[PDB]
């Protein structure tokens, strides 16, 4: 009955139940998908969080900066899904940028070591995961990553904006590689969502009026979006990622779908 | 379990069983939608074409330049679907440009009367169909128009390129109106498909260069698309339109979804 | 030694001494250009206004909707500039939209007759003027038109936004034709300037909240521009046009240069 | 008389007399500018090369990955130009990418260490040069970097495409900081030019595919550019950079000017 009936899908990036990846996983499961999950660092917490999903799925450790984790990933996925089976979908929902690279911290004062780490995790890892997983993906498959529209500069997002610009470019080359396997590669550019990264990384770097200034972001985004925007609701974004993982967008690759309430199409 | 089960959808633009609109109607019916079709000019002929669809659907006359057809449209649709019921979707799959505006005919020699006619039918009509139909659309509903990426100039498409550019802009303003109703408005920028218009209009205006240009279009597009492109197969485009008509892209509006094999994301 | 020393340049669009074209003309003559001016409708007024320029230039009548004017234009310019001389530059600084297509007047209520007149004058005439003048332009020549970034929808600009979208597309096709003559074609997307068109057309259609709403546009453009924006100063825009008329951007064609304080590059 | 008469301009990125920076330097001196040059590593040979410019100019060592070099840069330039004098122009004409990041080497096989070096040099350094030099730049001044349009993926350019996508994003935030000083920041996206990096980095990484790949690049570019394109001629690009360094584009910042024959505005 489900949009993703029978499909085996790897989903990275769950840390809490407000994670975009959590809702992607939840919707994908409501739609009949069989999941393999990956988690970073706080595996015990992640285990407890994933207990809240509609169906239990194996959790595999993946630090995208750890070459050993990347080299063993496909083997460990095959152990979880069974020999002779392959993935139909992969979700990259991963990002990091040091505090120096965000908020009210002067753009010029972020050392390259920090920026590099951020670009490693948030951009290059999209290609790493594709490298690791394409060899175990079925024709008609779909790789999806999460974006935040970086076409224009803005307060606060700072070097993460630069990392997203890189990610968009990486996705276009991932499409070229993926196409050899009959696999699509796309990004979903989401509007703002109240996640752990929002409050701890972005909010943490904004200093004092962070609470009110995020409320400004919500109000302004919902005003610009012709159909409105709810920062408390990741479901519209999760649904969009599932549309891309499905058979219903079979001719879209190297591309970006905007799940932002149409805010990026309006100036005011 | 159909993607569009229960949905009432108006589909304009069928003229042959190669029409992008025809495959849109076919796929939508396969997925449980209940359709109303609109046709232009030769309605007796169109009815024999629509007879080839999987299921019966009422066929309505609509010339988008005819003010009376537009003023009566919502009432005629309401009769077709039953008083009390509203539309969940609307598909604009219509375009025209006079020969002077196309092909090897010099760009400078198209009189404005001819360009204006093409822009009326191909761009302005997206707004006039939205005006007529929004008052009989449900929240969560979806308006979708057909686009051919006009961001760059090219041989042969000439003034139709300009009409498409206008249409993309018209779509962003329709989104502002549609949102007041909880309705989304998007275009699908399709790759090249073997349809009547490509033959009679584009081919016709290319004269002796039609063959070489159409061949280059078939193979060049496939070459550039990372997942490839079958110009003889409208299904991938029709599926993309159904995705937009569905509940699975609920946060996208005023936007363009590219069902072109990824070709627009690659230079070579 | 002036930027445009010895260049023969046609400049359209002067109506008042606040007109963008007036400032283009002044800066161009300050830089050694020999001008021919074209005016519409109010020829006695334009003659008077142009008496304020650094040098007296011949003024020719041109209503871009008048086929006879267009058909006789090259002949009339050749008279103004001398037989055996050709133009080095052409400036299109022309636009119109009926009130129904602007301001607080509902988008859906603008009749196509109104929209078509707006598009004729604002977009199609860029090609009309190129058709007329390219046969009397020197290699290395430059055609420049005035744009307002229409990539996103916005309040008030309405159907003019659609006309500018069309204009951008027209410019790319003009470039194809102009290249056959060794001539470049480009647009300058300017930020908001206090001109007759701004007060009469835009402010006129904004109703009672107009003078203040226009002030709020200034405030927001200036805030978004990393280098600020002064709506009272056309000179930075005129300078940019002069740069495109000069020999200093010889590799730029089919393109758009933004003289907008950089506001389009920033989200907030 | 000269376009840049009286201006003091720093030009980085000279490595051979085919360097785009060499032609920028030459044209700038021809136009009355006083230069300070920076070079990397091979300073003995760079000095030999700059002795062939029309005018004498101080040459300073700058490795952009060297923190000590950047920390001391403003003081060294001040020594070169005289205390109390400031720079009106800065040209960043610097890029690097390891071979593994380029050509026919598999996109997925580039280790992050290699990509990170390329991004540091090719993108981050645009920000570090701005950080170092803005304190000694005059209001009305101009920072210009060199781009190659990375909006679409393509053969061979591989991870350098990613670095350019990052660089474009960096330029937009540099614009925010530069505007506090009354300074503009922009990129010139150049068409392809035969330089040391083309030969050694791009051509070297293509191997047996270099001939065919570069022929198609060159043929396609000249075909698409409405005014044509000559890969052997850096002067149009050098002129465009000088236009940006001048007073003639005073309202453009955070932006990208294309010196590419108009190629990017045309599909074919
Ligand atoms: N929250 C928003 O408003 C928003 C908007 C647009 C895009 N995004 C993108 O959505 C994605 C999900 O972020 P979120 O908002 O759900 O935040 P989140 O805090 O819920 O998730 C971020 C994830 O990044 C993972 N991560 C960090 N370093 C990692 C590493 N080295 N290896 C593997 N995983 C690592 C963390 O474990 C965490 O699970 C990110 O790409 C984010 O940039 C978020
Ligand atoms: N075929 C392609 O390669 C292609 C690619 C991208 C986008 N498109 C767009 O797809 C849409 C459908 O085109 P298609 O290729 O299926 O061609 P088609 O010939 O099958 O359909 C074109 C339709 O336009 C309708 N039409 C013309 N004038 C009309 C009027 N006054 N009122 C109402 N309808 C009118 C025709 O009757 C016909 O049904 C158009 O917007 C077209 O530009 C086509
Ligand atoms: N003022 C702004 O904020 C702004 C911003 C960006 C772009 N522009 C563009 O700059 C250009 C000049 O406008 P402006 O702001 O200087 O206003 P303006 O009123 O000074 O100039 C508009 C000109 O258009 C001419 N025109 C109208 N109909 C014509 C016709 N049929 N034939 C020939 N000419 C006709 C008018 O006579 C007038 O001279 C237009 O393209 C406009 O869209 C203006
Ligand atoms: N050649 C083309 O077709 C082309 C086209 C568009 C853009 N570009 C860009 O133009 C710029 C100049 O390239 P080019 O083609 O003239 O090649 P080039 O080889 O002449 O110049 C590249 C410069 O980068 C410098 N560089 C490398 N590492 C450095 C470091 N650590 N510190 C300081 N400098 C360092 C090199 O010394 C060299 O001077 C680059 O940004 C390049 O990406 C080149
Ligand atoms: C106020 C600035 C506007 C941006 C807010 C939206 C947002 C929130 C969180 C996001 O995720 C991250 C951001 C930075 C670093 C890491 C992650 C996952 C993210 O990518 C985007
Ligand atoms: C070089 C590219 C030329 C072929 C483009 C593909 C195409 C084919 C048909 C299309 O439909 C029309 C084109 C013109 C007029 C009317 C219609 C429906 C259309 O909009 C696009
Ligand atoms: C509030 C809307 C956004 C600000 C508009 C700035 C502007 C002002 C005048 C312009 O010129 C015209 C506008 C409409 C019709 C005709 C012309 C010449 C124009 O093109 C742009
Ligand atoms: C076939 C590849 C596509 C055309 C490349 C044109 C080009 C050539 C050289 C360029 O400069 C560099 C490229 C890589 C690394 C460093 C530099 C300076 C560059 O940035 C662009």
JSON list of N, CA and C in Angstrom, two decimals, chain A residues 146-188:
[
{"chain": "A", "resi": 146, "resn": "UNK", "atom": "N", "xyz": [20.31, 16.62, 2.45]},
{"chain": "A", "resi": 146, "resn": "UNK", "atom": "CA", "xyz": [19.60, 17.79, 2.95]},
{"chain": "A", "resi": 146, "resn": "UNK", "atom": "C", "xyz": [20.44, 19.05, 2.73]},
{"chain": "A", "resi": 147, "resn": "UNK", "atom": "N", "xyz": [19.77, 20.08, 2.23]},
{"chain": "A", "resi": 147, "resn": "UNK", "atom": "CA", "xyz": [20.36, 21.35, 1.84]},
{"chain": "A", "resi": 147, "resn": "UNK", "atom": "C", "xyz": [19.64, 22.51, 2.56]},
{"chain": "A", "resi": 148, "resn": "UNK", "atom": "N", "xyz": [20.27, 23.68, 2.60]},
{"chain": "A", "resi": 148, "resn": "UNK", "atom": "CA", "xyz": [19.58, 24.90, 2.99]},
{"chain": "A", "resi": 148, "resn": "UNK", "atom": "C", "xyz": [20.06, 25.91, 1.93]},
{"chain": "A", "resi": 149, "resn": "UNK", "atom": "N", "xyz": [19.11, 26.46, 1.19]},
{"chain": "A", "resi": 149, "resn": "UNK", "atom": "CA", "xyz": [19.45, 27.30, 0.02]},
{"chain": "A", "resi": 149, "resn": "UNK", "atom": "C", "xyz": [20.54, 28.35, 0.28]},
{"chain": "A", "resi": 150, "resn": "UNK", "atom": "N", "xyz": [21.75, 28.15, -0.30]},
{"chain": "A", "resi": 150, "resn": "UNK", "atom": "CA", "xyz": [22.87, 29.05, -0.10]},
{"chain": "A", "resi": 150, "resn": "UNK", "atom": "C", "xyz": [23.19, 30.00, -1.25]},
{"chain": "A", "resi": 151, "resn": "UNK", "atom": "N", "xyz": [22.22, 30.20, -2.16]},
{"chain": "A", "resi": 151, "resn": "UNK", "atom": "CA", "xyz": [22.38, 31.03, -3.35]},
{"chain": "A", "resi": 151, "resn": "UNK", "atom": "C", "xyz": [22.72, 32.49, -3.01]},
{"chain": "A", "resi": 152, "resn": "UNK", "atom": "N", "xyz": [22.32, 32.91, -1.81]},
{"chain": "A", "resi": 152, "resn": "UNK", "atom": "CA", "xyz": [22.53, 34.29, -1.33]},
{"chain": "A", "resi": 152, "resn": "UNK", "atom": "C", "xyz": [23.11, 34.20, 0.07]},
{"chain": "A", "resi": 153, "resn": "UNK", "atom": "N", "xyz": [23.92, 35.19, 0.45]},
{"chain": "A", "resi": 153, "resn": "UNK", "atom": "CA", "xyz": [24.51, 35.20, 1.77]},
{"chain": "A", "resi": 153, "resn": "UNK", "atom": "C", "xyz": [23.46, 35.73, 2.75]},
{"chain": "A", "resi": 154, "resn": "UNK", "atom": "N", "xyz": [23.67, 35.50, 4.04]},
{"chain": "A", "resi": 154, "resn": "UNK", "atom": "CA", "xyz": [22.67, 35.89, 5.03]},
{"chain": "A", "resi": 154, "resn": "UNK", "atom": "C", "xyz": [23.38, 35.99, 6.36]},
{"chain": "A", "resi": 155, "resn": "UNK", "atom": "N", "xyz": [22.76, 36.68, 7.33]},
{"chain": "A", "resi": 155, "resn": "UNK", "atom": "CA", "xyz": [23.30, 36.62, 8.68]},
{"chain": "A", "resi": 155, "resn": "UNK", "atom": "C", "xyz": [23.40, 35.19, 9.23]},
{"chain": "A", "resi": 156, "resn": "UNK", "atom": "N", "xyz": [24.37, 34.97, 10.12]},
{"chain": "A", "resi": 156, "resn": "UNK", "atom": "CA", "xyz": [24.38, 33.77, 10.98]},
{"chain": "A", "resi": 156, "resn": "UNK", "atom": "C", "xyz": [24.79, 32.45, 10.35]},
{"chain": "A", "resi": 157, "resn": "UNK", "atom": "N", "xyz": [24.36, 32.15, 9.13]},
{"chain": "A", "resi": 157, "resn": "UNK", "atom": "CA", "xyz": [24.66, 30.82, 8.58]},
{"chain": "A", "resi": 157, "resn": "UNK", "atom": "C", "xyz": [26.13, 30.76, 8.13]},
{"chain": "A", "resi": 158, "resn": "UNK", "atom": "N", "xyz": [26.69, 31.93, 7.79]},
{"chain": "A", "resi": 158, "resn": "UNK", "atom": "CA", "xyz": [28.15, 32.08, 7.66]},
{"chain": "A", "resi": 158, "resn": "UNK", "atom": "C", "xyz": [28.83, 30.98, 6.84]},
{"chain": "A", "resi": 159, "resn": "UNK", "atom": "N", "xyz": [29.79, 30.25, 7.42]},
{"chain": "A", "resi": 159, "resn": "UNK", "atom": "CA", "xyz": [30.53, 29.23, 6.70]},
{"chain": "A", "resi": 159, "resn": "UNK", "atom": "C", "xyz": [29.73, 27.96, 6.39]},
{"chain": "A", "resi": 160, "resn": "UNK", "atom": "N", "xyz": [28.61, 27.74, 7.09]},
{"chain": "A", "resi": 160, "resn": "UNK", "atom": "CA", "xyz": [27.73, 26.63, 6.70]},
{"chain": "A", "resi": 160, "resn": "UNK", "atom": "C", "xyz": [27.12, 26.91, 5.32]},
{"chain": "A", "resi": 161, "resn": "UNK", "atom": "N", "xyz": [26.87, 28.19, 5.01]},
{"chain": "A", "resi": 161, "resn": "UNK", "atom": "CA", "xyz": [26.38, 28.57, 3.69]},
{"chain": "A", "resi": 161, "resn": "UNK", "atom": "C", "xyz": [27.39, 28.09, 2.62]},
{"chain": "A", "resi": 162, "resn": "UNK", "atom": "N", "xyz": [28.67, 28.28, 2.90]},
{"chain": "A", "resi": 162, "resn": "UNK", "atom": "CA", "xyz": [29.74, 27.93, 1.97]},
{"chain": "A", "resi": 162, "resn": "UNK", "atom": "C", "xyz": [29.78, 26.38, 1.80]},
{"chain": "A", "resi": 163, "resn": "UNK", "atom": "N", "xyz": [29.60, 25.68, 2.91]},
{"chain": "A", "resi": 163, "resn": "UNK", "atom": "CA", "xyz": [29.52, 24.24, 2.90]},
{"chain": "A", "resi": 163, "resn": "UNK", "atom": "C", "xyz": [28.32, 23.73, 2.10]},
{"chain": "A", "resi": 164, "resn": "UNK", "atom": "N", "xyz": [27.15, 24.38, 2.25]},
{"chain": "A", "resi": 164, "resn": "UNK", "atom": "CA", "xyz": [26.00, 24.02, 1.39]},
{"chain": "A", "resi": 164, "resn": "UNK", "atom": "C", "xyz": [26.26, 24.30, -0.10]},
{"chain": "A", "resi": 165, "resn": "UNK", "atom": "N", "xyz": [26.85, 25.45, -0.42]},
{"chain": "A", "resi": 165, "resn": "UNK", "atom": "CA", "xyz": [27.23, 25.69, -1.83]},
{"chain": "A", "resi": 165, "resn": "UNK", "atom": "C", "xyz": [28.11, 24.57, -2.41]},
{"chain": "A", "resi": 166, "resn": "UNK", "atom": "N", "xyz": [29.09, 24.13, -1.62]},
{"chain": "A", "resi": 166, "resn": "UNK", "atom": "CA", "xyz": [29.93, 22.98, -1.97]},
{"chain": "A", "resi": 166, "resn": "UNK", "atom": "C", "xyz": [29.09, 21.71, -2.12]},
{"chain": "A", "resi": 167, "resn": "UNK", "atom": "N", "xyz": [28.18, 21.46, -1.16]},
{"chain": "A", "resi": 167, "resn": "UNK", "atom": "CA", "xyz": [27.32, 20.27, -1.20]},
{"chain": "A", "resi": 167, "resn": "UNK", "atom": "C", "xyz": [26.51, 20.22, -2.51]},
{"chain": "A", "resi": 168, "resn": "UNK", "atom": "N", "xyz": [25.96, 21.37, -2.93]},
{"chain": "A", "resi": 168, "resn": "UNK", "atom": "CA", "xyz": [25.16, 21.39, -4.14]},
{"chain": "A", "resi": 168, "resn": "UNK", "atom": "C", "xyz": [26.03, 20.99, -5.31]},
{"chain": "A", "resi": 169, "resn": "UNK", "atom": "N", "xyz": [27.27, 21.45, -5.30]},
{"chain": "A", "resi": 169, "resn": "UNK", "atom": "CA", "xyz": [28.17, 21.15, -6.41]},
{"chain": "A", "resi": 169, "resn": "UNK", "atom": "C", "xyz": [28.54, 19.66, -6.37]},
{"chain": "A", "resi": 170, "resn": "UNK", "atom": "N", "xyz": [28.84, 19.16, -5.17]},
{"chain": "A", "resi": 170, "resn": "UNK", "atom": "CA", "xyz": [29.13, 17.71, -4.98]},
{"chain": "A", "resi": 170, "resn": "UNK", "atom": "C", "xyz": [27.99, 16.83, -5.50]},
{"chain": "A", "resi": 171, "resn": "UNK", "atom": "N", "xyz": [26.75, 17.19, -5.14]},
{"chain": "A", "resi": 171, "resn": "UNK", "atom": "CA", "xyz": [25.56, 16.43, -5.59]},
{"chain": "A", "resi": 171, "resn": "UNK", "atom": "C", "xyz": [25.51, 16.27, -7.15]},
{"chain": "A", "resi": 172, "resn": "UNK", "atom": "N", "xyz": [25.87, 17.34, -7.87]},
{"chain": "A", "resi": 172, "resn": "UNK", "atom": "CA", "xyz": [25.88, 17.31, -9.34]},
{"chain": "A", "resi": 172, "resn": "UNK", "atom": "C", "xyz": [26.89, 16.31, -9.90]},
{"chain": "A", "resi": 173, "resn": "UNK", "atom": "N", "xyz": [28.04, 16.18, -9.24]},
{"chain": "A", "resi": 173, "resn": "UNK", "atom": "CA", "xyz": [29.01, 15.13, -9.61]},
{"chain": "A", "resi": 173, "resn": "UNK", "atom": "C", "xyz": [28.62, 13.75, -9.11]},
{"chain": "A", "resi": 174, "resn": "UNK", "atom": "N", "xyz": [28.01, 13.68, -7.93]},
{"chain": "A", "resi": 174, "resn": "UNK", "atom": "CA", "xyz": [27.47, 12.39, -7.46]},
{"chain": "A", "resi": 174, "resn": "UNK", "atom": "C", "xyz": [26.44, 11.88, -8.47]},
{"chain": "A", "resi": 175, "resn": "UNK", "atom": "N", "xyz": [25.62, 12.77, -9.02]},
{"chain": "A", "resi": 175, "resn": "UNK", "atom": "CA", "xyz": [24.65, 12.32, -10.07]},
{"chain": "A", "resi": 175, "resn": "UNK", "atom": "C", "xyz": [25.34, 11.66, -11.26]},
{"chain": "A", "resi": 176, "resn": "UNK", "atom": "N", "xyz": [26.49, 12.18, -11.68]},
{"chain": "A", "resi": 176, "resn": "UNK", "atom": "CA", "xyz": [27.20, 11.58, -12.80]},
{"chain": "A", "resi": 176, "resn": "UNK", "atom": "C", "xyz": [27.65, 10.16, -12.45]},
{"chain": "A", "resi": 177, "resn": "UNK", "atom": "N", "xyz": [28.16, 9.97, -11.24]},
{"chain": "A", "resi": 177, "resn": "UNK", "atom": "CA", "xyz": [28.62, 8.62, -10.85]},
{"chain": "A", "resi": 177, "resn": "UNK", "atom": "C", "xyz": [27.43, 7.69, -10.69]},
{"chain": "A", "resi": 178, "resn": "UNK", "atom": "N", "xyz": [26.40, 8.17, -9.97]},
{"chain": "A", "resi": 178, "resn": "UNK", "atom": "CA", "xyz": [25.21, 7.38, -9.65]},
{"chain": "A", "resi": 178, "resn": "UNK", "atom": "C", "xyz": [24.49, 6.94, -10.92]},
{"chain": "A", "resi": 179, "resn": "UNK", "atom": "N", "xyz": [24.49, 7.79, -11.96]},
{"chain": "A", "resi": 179, "resn": "UNK", "atom": "CA", "xyz": [23.77, 7.48, -13.16]},
{"chain": "A", "resi": 179, "resn": "UNK", "atom": "C", "xyz": [24.28, 6.19, -13.79]},
{"chain": "A", "resi": 180, "resn": "UNK", "atom": "N", "xyz": [25.57, 5.88, -13.58]},
{"chain": "A", "resi": 180, "resn": "UNK", "atom": "CA", "xyz": [26.17, 4.64, -14.15]},
{"chain": "A", "resi": 180, "resn": "UNK", "atom": "C", "xyz": [25.51, 3.39, -13.55]},
{"chain": "A", "resi": 181, "resn": "UNK", "atom": "N", "xyz": [24.89, 3.57, -12.39]},
{"chain": "A", "resi": 181, "resn": "UNK", "atom": "CA", "xyz": [24.21, 2.49, -11.67]},
{"chain": "A", "resi": 181, "resn": "UNK", "atom": "C", "xyz": [22.69, 2.56, -11.82]},
{"chain": "A", "resi": 182, "resn": "UNK", "atom": "N", "xyz": [22.19, 3.57, -12.55]},
{"chain": "A", "resi": 182, "resn": "UNK", "atom": "CA", "xyz": [20.75, 3.77, -12.71]},
{"chain": "A", "resi": 182, "resn": "UNK", "atom": "C", "xyz": [20.15, 4.37, -11.46]},
{"chain": "A", "resi": 183, "resn": "UNK", "atom": "N", "xyz": [20.98, 5.10, -10.74]},
{"chain": "A", "resi": 183, "resn": "UNK", "atom": "CA", "xyz": [20.60, 5.68, -9.43]},
{"chain": "A", "resi": 183, "resn": "UNK", "atom": "C", "xyz": [20.52, 7.22, -9.54]},
{"chain": "A", "resi": 184, "resn": "UNK", "atom": "N", "xyz": [19.54, 7.84, -8.86]},
{"chain": "A", "resi": 184, "resn": "UNK", "atom": "CA", "xyz": [19.38, 9.28, -8.86]},
{"chain": "A", "resi": 184, "resn": "UNK", "atom": "C", "xyz": [20.10, 9.86, -7.66]},
{"chain": "A", "resi": 185, "resn": "UNK", "atom": "N", "xyz": [20.50, 11.13, -7.77]},
{"chain": "A", "resi": 185, "resn": "UNK", "atom": "CA", "xyz": [21.09, 11.85, -6.62]},
{"chain": "A", "resi": 185, "resn": "UNK", "atom": "C", "xyz": [20.49, 13.23, -6.56]},
{"chain": "A", "resi": 186, "resn": "UNK", "atom": "N", "xyz": [19.84, 13.59, -5.45]},
{"chain": "A", "resi": 186, "resn": "UNK", "atom": "CA", "xyz": [19.26, 14.94, -5.36]},
{"chain": "A", "resi": 186, "resn": "UNK", "atom": "C", "xyz": [19.33, 15.46, -3.95]},
{"chain": "A", "resi": 187, "resn": "UNK", "atom": "N", "xyz": [19.11, 16.76, -3.83]},
{"chain": "A", "resi": 187, "resn": "UNK", "atom": "CA", "xyz": [19.04, 17.39, -2.52]},
{"chain": "A", "resi": 187, "resn": "UNK", "atom": "C", "xyz": [17.66, 17.94, -2.24]},
{"chain": "A", "resi": 188, "resn": "UNK", "atom": "N", "xyz": [17.26, 17.93, -0.98]},
{"chain": "A", "resi": 188, "resn": "UNK", "atom": "CA", "xyz": [16.07, 18.68, -0.58]},
{"chain": "A", "resi": 188, "resn": "UNK", "atom": "C", "xyz": [16.52, 19.88, 0.23]}
]
